[PDB]
């Protein structure tokens, strides 16, 4: 009965269904227009930010379309658990960042992490087009790990 976030943006989503390929300028224009007409503001704010962000959007879509909520700790853990290869890939980047001695190195890792994210996002695109929810689940947990690294890159400091 409860409206989905896609139902809060009728212009942007005439079909009222969950989709991955959002037209973000239209979302944004509609969001601005809707805000220009406290609780009600913050509820539309949650919704808009969920849809604008690739990670939050994939997590929300999988909740609605496949009923898997990756924002819950144990659901994410059962997915990730199966994938020790991914776990080790991610830890190795954490340890690479630890071994960086200078800004130049750190900005390299960061560039590479940003390319991983737009690559995952493109792959999520193809998953949702082909309705491969299972593949999208794996990529969405992996995406979180790369988003988490983005702030470690931002906050890095030259020292002991």
From Swiss-Prot:
The keyword Cell cycle appears for this protein: no
PROSITE patterns: DNAJ_2 (PS50076)
UniProt subcellular location: Mitochondrion matrix
Gene null: resulting phenotype: Increases association between GRX5 and SSQ1. Inviable vegetative cell population growth.
CDD domains xrefs: DnaJ
Coiled coil: none
Ribosomal protein recorded as keyword: no
Domain J, chain residue ranges per copy: 4-64
Annotated spans, Interaction with ISU1: 53-160
Pfam families: DnaJ (PF00226), HSCB_C (PF07743)
Family annotation (InterPro entries): DnaJ_domain, HscB, HscB_C_sf, HscB_oligo_C, J_dom_sf
Any GO molecular function: protein-folding chaperone binding
Alphabetized UniProt keyword annotations: Chaperone, Mitochondrion, Stress response, Transit peptide
GO CC annotation, single: mitochondrion
UniProt GO BP: [2Fe-2S] cluster assembly; [4Fe-4S] cluster assembly; aerobic respiration; intracellular iron ion homeostasis; iron-sulfur cluster assembly; protein complex oligomerization
Reported function: Co-chaperone required for the assembly of iron-sulfur (Fe/S) clusters in mitochondria. Stimulates the ATPase activity of its specialized Hsp70 chaperone partner SSQ1, to mediate the transfer of iron-sulfur clusters from ISU1 to GRX5. Binds to the substrate protein ISU1 and targets it to SSQ1.
Note: Present with 2010 molecules/cell in log phase SD medium.
Self-association state and partner proteins as the record states: Interacts with ISU1 and SSQ1.
Cross-referenced NCBIfam families: hscB
Family membership: Belongs to the HscB family.
Name of the protein described by the UniProt record: J-type co-chaperone JAC1, mitochondrial
Organism: Saccharomyces cerevisiae (strain ATCC 204508 / S288c) (Baker's yeast)
């Amino acid at each position: 009965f409860t409206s989905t976030f896609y139902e809060l943006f009728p212009k942007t989503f005439p079909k009222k269904l969950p989709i991955w390929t959002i037209d973000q300028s239209r979302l944004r224009k509609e969001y601005r227009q809707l805000q220009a007409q406290s609780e009600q503001s913050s509820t539309l704010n949650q919704a808009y930010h969920t849809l604008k962000d690739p990670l939050r959007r994939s997590q929300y879509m999988l909740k609605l379309l496949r009923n898997i909520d990756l924002t819950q700790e144990q659901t994410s853990n059962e997915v990730t658990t199966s994938d020790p290869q991914l776990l080790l890939k991610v830890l190795d980047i954490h340890d690479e960042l630890s071994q960086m001695d200078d800004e130049a190195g750190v900005k390299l890792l960061e560039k590479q992490n940003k390319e991983r994210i737009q690559d995952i996002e493109a792959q999520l695109g193809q998953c949702y087009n082909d309705k491969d929810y299972a593949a999208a689940v794996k990529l969405t947990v992996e995406l979180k790990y790369w988003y988490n690294l983005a702030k470690a890159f931002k906050d890095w400091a030259p020292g002991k």
